[PDB]
Symmetry: D2
Subunit: 474 residues, 4 copies
């Protein structure tokens, strides 16, 4: 099995202990990654803080040049990297390659967005006549060392989405990949090293949560934490951050509100595409349908017809539904299915589990006493909840602890806009599925879905602070 | 009838000759304004350039205070000013008082928009690594002396819309009102004088076109020309502007496109309100209905019923339809009406003329060989043009030499947005009449409808420039 | 000696128990404020959440109108409120009236800033040709219920600095003043009630920290915490906020860096003004002089002469140096002074204490082993620390746990800009004392000085989120 | 080695019945010919642009940007080839000519990326009146239409690209009129855009005689925007013909270098000489008059003199600092300014010599305001030193110019320098540096007779865009 190494101060480093990584869909041993000690974490962080001065003092053009070179290498190696990513997290091969290509796009876009960093000149005389000769020159500065923690379900894309915005602004970065996804994260690191990223400007950390999990976050060297993952883990990291700024991209339970005047066929298409992409292992998937009763029977039938068309199988054959990330995930999903069956929900598609490969299950007549109406499955199960009023749909949508995105399906757009104002989410898509993209758009979520605003320019703003220099004109 | 004076360098001045102003609806003598000589114009401009140095170096908050005080006085005297405005341009009494109130709202909003405008700091290292220590401190500055030329149909509101944005940014201003509307303009000036506006910072010019018309525009002291009026006069001002920046607000022939799924009663209500407000003497009036044939009979009937309810009479009686601004105006409108009748259009409401009071004429089955399909009437006549496709409506709308605004009446908003993209206008209103407001929104016209972007913040941007101070950090 | 009441859902409410407040400088009984119960806290928050829907659905201009009226009432009552603020926190009478006037200025400025926070329209075709018909409409929304916690040293100004920016954006607010400072905060509340602020939109909470201290912050009704106070208290509040956003304005130890080419008399003038204002009880306040050896003797003599001339006495006599807020504060300052003397620092002005009135102490030859080099005194003591190089000055400045502001005194502005880049602070003032103002400028601290960015526009941005509505054009 | 060049018109390369032969100003070498278009051929150019506009403005920003990046890559590839001809055509040093092409590619790339992330905005009716609180305005950017871009002889490629790429990224279509002297370089630039695949009619070129098409190209109703760099008299003419169409003008300058008593004289002299004599002073942004306080004037004049004497005087191919001026009229005009200064008593610190149109660099001291050289823009290698008594006098004399492009201030007192800058009637003030257009992201603008509009990259894009507002009521 290929033995991988961490990038530490421009060098590739093994550790005494290793973690072996297996393909979720087959059990194939893919390789090993280091299990770092706390002392090895200290060395990563010390090398990053030492590199920071010379990195922040480079020009924006020079930092952008490194990012563009790294993106070119990712494009060159997209097939090579995608093939391993596909195996590591049981993502379809074509989709895995697409994740790498999208990462290159985000890196390039972040390089050009960030190099155009501008500041403000504020007039004292806007506020007080006596200060009319006093002006404030307000420029952006890096926050320092950014700890970027990527998630299993986008181990390259949602590493680069943090790395490149941080780096263009003059931050230094330590990437902690998820254990399942650490190989792909280190493959991304290879591109940044080959691009010539200066030693210590970008580093990687891998290891066991029991050894370094709290340590990497509590370390005084870290100035900013940028995390994507589960809501419980995110909340715990937040407790360890202190007053240091943190960004959290946590779970979702995005509602799809279907009104009586909606094109139910088009609604079903978008709903099924969004709900079941990557087997539903996405924070921004459609995860519950809130439908007006008078159209529920036909919407349910429309959704069912497309679910039965979803291909089910292995990542290497580019199936729509692939095996889930591990056995705990498939067990949790089966447990939600069973709770819905026990409580009287109607299964419109047939449950089948071969290993951790769960066939897509569609439930109708889901009620608010069922766990599936509320809990995020991270699996290919979709509930339908019938409502009698738009007010009821809004109330149930907002009753969720999550608030990432929502979809509204209707032909009355002025009405949809007014509904969107009332929904406790970050983004509402009209007559389409929820989605993070395009990556220039803001991406954020309310309540337990996280904290901070991403999308490219927003992520750059988040990982900078302002420095105001004030002086008096004579 | 009173004898009015120009505001020149803090003093109120008569001239040797004057212009007596009469009420278009009744012939009543309203008062007189000075007929300035070219030498007296020179004195206005020389006073303004002398005042600019001390005005531009005041704080924003000091300039805003003058503007707020002037707006307060306008509100106090809204009846006094509006009553004369009403007679001067045969605008309904209520509408004229409302014009003055709106002017105060625009002046206040401009003061607060302008006083918090900002500069920017740009990085040499965004463009060139060798320049990474070079920064540009970019601050706003006035353009200098603004010549504001207001129109007869809004002699106060479209004076204030120029004066206040100019003044908050540190420009000095000369107002040339229309001769018909010059008393109202001088009454506006009295408010700024009572507010304490420093001598020369704001001045007025009145006189005969034959004596000073070209002279005021060609004068080298003027740094910026801001004009509202007819398209032919605006074309003349362009020929005189030389290299100086100009803004022009000229004529329109705004289309109201009514699709098959429109709320025809809502459409008819908006169309009649927009078309016949101030007897059609507005650049932003609905001036042609482009309706899909399958709803045309019903839309026509709904419009006809509303047009028949409009009152026709004198400004003091707040008639919907008041007498037009002069005899040439009414002659021109009568000719358009006669051309349509003679070429076979259906007169749904009947033509009558008493003096220059023309009753509101609604034509159906208008064809594009009729002058009324294209020429801006500035009178109370509206054509209905039947089309068979949306594409034909777009083509006919865009064939016009004008391009100010358009209205689209439909329940399919994504489609309306796609239509709006193809319409050669500044603003498209969905399920509403065309309108300049709200005054924070951009107001602009394409093609022969003008040049530059107004609405408050845009007008301020247009009458400011920048000064950049570049240095190297050491 | 009045009995004050909390504003709760538009009504003035006593509590079963109350707390008597005495003037720190004289011991005069000023009045009592309610000792609220946890149930009374619940009722405040329930009132706020009930009022939120009708408040956020008002127009911006309507919310601004309430704020302008409250500011007008504060100007009207500035002498009346300032007279009591002066006694309550032992601030000079004239300085206390000035605080009230400044609060009115900040409230008016926030109203006008917040009503023109515009939104963004983002193009999908900026990122992906396939998404060129997809656009994102991004508008700001309130976060909900803001808990505002004001400090004793600006109990009106740094209450209004939170209330007004919160309210204009459509948030509802509960103000918790410090107990010493609660009368002044309730007097501010009176202005908002007289202005007609709708019931429950703005409320106050008073009581003993033992009973309600943690309770007010941990309550799930609170969506946002905005705190000014000591670093230890703010740190503890940060832990109780969980994942909810929080702004912290904490302590400082602002350095004044004085180079060999500085105007020493000018530096001394500004240093003394900034260090000893309100007896040093300010977070933004020159609290250590880092001076190059060769001009240290000269600077110290200039500073000494000014310190000797500061007036020491009672608030009602507008003394420069007034009594500290309580006995614990003066004991703490005395302990720092005694430590510096014991370790060999030169007391250039003499220590004297009567009650809690400490005379201003200037120390020279302070070293980094002395507590006074690092700990924030919140009293009238100022250390001079001699350094041999600019590099050492930067190192010592940045070694502080605090990072609020710094001053640089030098005639080499390009060099000062480069030094400013290296200082771990929010704002650097060149050739002037550190200060929060003008209030349109950003105000922020690094490290233990807090979190979040204030100044008016920044505070409004902080207490809003964005809502993105995405749709596809046809 | 002279080639017959053609205009790019609607995706095709077109000769005209008449042509204009172009000669190298430093040597007389025949370089080639460019077409002498008729008005009817201009009509065909504009008709093809307007027809191409509909499909071009509806492309995504990404798609438009890719064309620009490819064109820039091609210019970098051919920089040596293009620069070699540019050097001869406008008698610019060969190395400096190659650098101009490289800078052109940098501006094109930067404009593509600046323009593609431009945004619209949404405004609230409730900001202005309560009754309209549910009304919002969705405001998006749109091109203005057909941009006429007119480049200058002194930067025939760089200040063609500075107009073309900002215009194109925003969805405008473009017609480039190069100066006759420079038209070969302009058509060489066009070849790169053609090779990059720019759609037929989206970018086109026009060449011809002023007497035939000069006014015609500007007055034509197809043109929606005129973007011009050139002399002040020509720009005045364009303003007379623009009508109500938006214009941008980059005209002449007489930039002052204000040298205070506390100035770094060594750095001041270095920057003054580099800025004043770059490309023989044929730059709108050259240092063109030194306003120096009496106390330091003798020392500054001595050091400037020493550096002027170090400048090489010679041929473009030899990379001389001072090359021959663009034509005989230019040299005659410069000689006349020199004679007026001499006859009125100015001190010639360096010697005037003229060989053909190659004028040696002339430094004058004790220049007074009765002398033409105090005011008139030479566009040649002559620099006056004007001794002033105060900064107030330097401001007064600086602002008395009809020009108002840039200024330099040399002083160690930066807060004072900012207050001086506030009083100077110029677009940009450079502290302790020569005046200059760059960096190209910075604003570039001139007041008074120096022009109209603001360039630098993002500013030029803003100027050649308008907005479209769509207003609706939320329910």
């Amino acid at each position: 099995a290929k033995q991988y190494k961490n990038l530490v101060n421009g060098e590739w480093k093994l550790s005494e202990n290793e973690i072996t990584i297996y393909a979720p869909a087959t059990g194939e041993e893919l390789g090993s990654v280091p299990a770092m000690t706390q002392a090895e974490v200290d060395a990563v962080y010390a090398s990053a803080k030492k590199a920071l001065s010379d990195w922040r003092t480079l020009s924006y053009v020079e930092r952008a040049a490194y990012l563009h070179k790294a993106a070119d290498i990712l494009v060159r190696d997209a097939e090579k990297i995608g093939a391993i990513l596909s195996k590591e997290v049981a993502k379809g091969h074509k989709a895995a390659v697409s994740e790498v290509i999208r990462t290159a796009e985000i890196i390039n876009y972040a390089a050009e967005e960030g190099l155009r960093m501008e500041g403000e000149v504020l007039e004292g005389g806007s506020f007080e006549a006596a200060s009319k000769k006093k002006i404030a020159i307000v420029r952006r500065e890096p926050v320092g060392l950014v700890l970027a923690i990527s998630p299993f379900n986008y181990p390259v894309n949602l590493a680069g989405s943090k790395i490149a915005p941080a780096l263009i602004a003059g931050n230094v970065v330590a990437l902690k990949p998820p254990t399942q996804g650490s190989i792909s994260g280190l493959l991304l690191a290879e591109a940044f090293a080959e691009a010539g990223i200066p030693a210590g400007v970008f580093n990687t950390i891998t290891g066991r949560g029991s050894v370094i999990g709290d340590y990497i976050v509590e370390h005084e060297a870290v100035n900013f934490i940028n995390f994507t993952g589960s809501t419980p883990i995110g909340e715990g990291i937040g407790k360890l951050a202190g007053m240091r700024p943190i960004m959290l991209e946590l779970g979702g339970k995005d509602s799809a509100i279907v009104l009586e005047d909606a094109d139910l066929a088009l609604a079903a298409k978008n709903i099924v595409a969004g709900a079941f992409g990557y087997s539903g292992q996405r924070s921004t998937a459609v995860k519950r349908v809130l439908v007006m009763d008078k159209v529920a029977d036909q919407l349910a039938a429309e959704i069912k017809t497309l679910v039965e068309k979803l291909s089910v199988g292995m990542p290497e054959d580019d199936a729509d539904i692939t095996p889930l990330i591990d056995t705990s995930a498939a067990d949790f999903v089966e447990g939600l299915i069973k709770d819905a069956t026990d409580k009287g929900a109607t299964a419109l598609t047939a449950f089948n589990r071969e290993g951790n490969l769960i066939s897509p299950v569609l439930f109708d007549h889901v009620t608010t006493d069922m766990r599936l109406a509320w809990e995020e499955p991270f699996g290919p199960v979709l509930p339908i909840i019938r409502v009698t009023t738009v007010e009821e749909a809004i109330k149930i949508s907002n009753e969720s602890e999550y608030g990432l995105q929502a979809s509204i399906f209707t032909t009355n757009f002025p009405k949809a806009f007014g509904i969107a104002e009332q929904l406790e989410v970050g983004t509402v898509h009209l007559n389409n599925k929820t989605q993070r993209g395009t990556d220039n758009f803001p991406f954020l979520g309310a309540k337990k879905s996280g904290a901070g605003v991403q999308g490219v320019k927003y992520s750059i703003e988040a990982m900078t602070t302002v420095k105001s220099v004030v002086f008096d004109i004579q």
